[PDB]
Structure 1
Amino acid sequence: KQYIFQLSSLNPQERIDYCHLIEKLGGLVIEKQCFDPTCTHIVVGHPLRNEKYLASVAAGKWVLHRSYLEACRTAGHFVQEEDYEWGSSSILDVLTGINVQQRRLALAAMRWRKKIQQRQESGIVEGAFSGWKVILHVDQSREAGFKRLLQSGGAKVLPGHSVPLFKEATHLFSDVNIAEAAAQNVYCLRTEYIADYLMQESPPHVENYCLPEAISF
């Protein structure tokens, strides 16, 4: 009903042209660079395993090829999204070539969009990390990006890593007493689990991501 777009990985002339077009068709453009969960649609020049793309997937947004906005321009209104989804057979047929990484990111975006939007049609909005209550233990340079990615998918990020937080926590991610968290029914996992959870067709085996101090639990 109200279309709200962000743009990623586009050239400058494209960005200007598409912002103009979106506004002309009655959409809103979020011009700020970080992912904003207010958006409904993201148009990306190529999939990347970065925070903005993974956050769009974790939130189940429409992740669309630029040919979507060319179809809108021709129609003079926002058209049906499905055939312009990055993971769609229609787009994968449209491309001359795609690397396995980009194909996997494209299929992940479509898989999560279908799941999250099917539930939305039934009156529940939940992201890929719904029910996660997370302790982060990462390098300061990485903390804010992990927090933004987890919150985009619906996770609650707990304030710090003190022992009282282990009771409510579901997950602790490390790049603090790990064995005590593990003893309090916290999955204590390497940070690779987050991208791999979004990307893998079936949920990753936690055993492959379990931090050393937690292997017993």
Structure 2
Amino acid sequence: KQYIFQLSSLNPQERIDYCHLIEKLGGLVIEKQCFDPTCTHIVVGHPLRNEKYLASVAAGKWVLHRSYLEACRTAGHFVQEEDYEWGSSSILDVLTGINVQQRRLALAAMRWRKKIQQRQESGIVEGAFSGWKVILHVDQSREAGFKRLLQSGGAKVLPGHSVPLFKEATHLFSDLGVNIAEAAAQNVYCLRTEYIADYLMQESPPHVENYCLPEAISFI
């Protein structure tokens, strides 16, 4: 049990003060902007749909309201996290006015934290994409970001998209070359990239039929 924080959407003075506090209590703060899988807790000023937030959800981190740290300060130790989760009733029944997007991001973070924890309590490693073996066929501009998000949820991303890799893959995601029909014939889930984020965000998992790539539909 570890206390490794990253901070998001807070101002510099808040970050300085919170870093000081976290360190005094025996925690660590990872200062780099990019999501770091070694963190355990992220304190978020206001939930935004971005790579860092999505990766935190894929990894099942505590995604916390800053009132968590104020409670730690008072207590003089790291307190129980559940009542400070952005998606907890304790926060959401008090911030009844936040917009629908932030509510959605909050709930998704709490839901995956709980689900991943429940699975980890049963010896399943990693996060939302645990056991996925993924072939990625996307635009060079989007490639690194998709890889990082998948890896943050515990997916292995395979090198390239050659036919021999189909026998190793569970999933193939493509931007709307690569032989999709053959991958589908070899029972790979051949899906639009929107599936990845929708798997993280949706209360009930996206259904493969709706995300299936055109050449793979008959193989469902």
TM-score range, shorter chain: over 0.9
Q: How many residues align?
A: 217
Two-structure CA RMSD over aligned residues (Å)? 1.2
How far apart, CA to CA, are the structure 2 residues paired with 1:58 and 1:190? Answer: 18
What is residue 33 of structure 1 aligned with on the other side? 33
Question: Higher mean Cα deviation, 77-86 or 91-100?
Answer: 91-100
Deviation per residue, 1:51-88 (Å, 9 max, x gap): 11111111111000011011111111111100100000
**Structure 1 residue ranges, 4+ long, deviating more than 2 angstroms after superposition:** 118-126
How big is the shift at 1:96? 5.2
Deviation per residue, 1:183-211 (Å, 9 max, x gap): 11111111110111111111111111111
How far apart, CA to CA, are the structure 2 residues paired with 1:159 and 1:48? Answer: 31
How far apart, CA to CA, are the structure 1 residues paired with 2:124 and 2:136? Answer: 27
Deviation per residue, 1:100-156 (Å, 9 max, x gap): 111111111111111111232344323100111101111111111111100110100
How far apart, CA to CA, are the structure 2 residues paired with 1:123 and 1:178? Answer: 34
Secondary structure of the residue aligned to 1:7 is: strand
Structure 1 length as normaliser, TM-score? Answer: 0.96
> Between the two proteins, what is the percent identity of the paired residues?
100
How far apart, CA to CA, are the structure 2 residues paired with 1:177 and 1:119? Answer: 35
Structure 2 length as normaliser, TM-score? Answer: 0.95
Relative to 1, partners in 2 of residues 1:123 and 1:185: Cα closer, same or farther, differing over 3 Å? closer
How far apart, CA to CA, are the structure 2 residues paired with 1:85 and 1:108? Answer: 11
- Segments of 5+ residues of structure 2 without an aligned counterpart are none
How far apart, CA to CA, are the structure 1 residues paired with 2:130 and 2:151? Answer: 9
How big is the shift at 1:178? 1.0
Secondary structure of the residue aligned to 1:106 is: helix
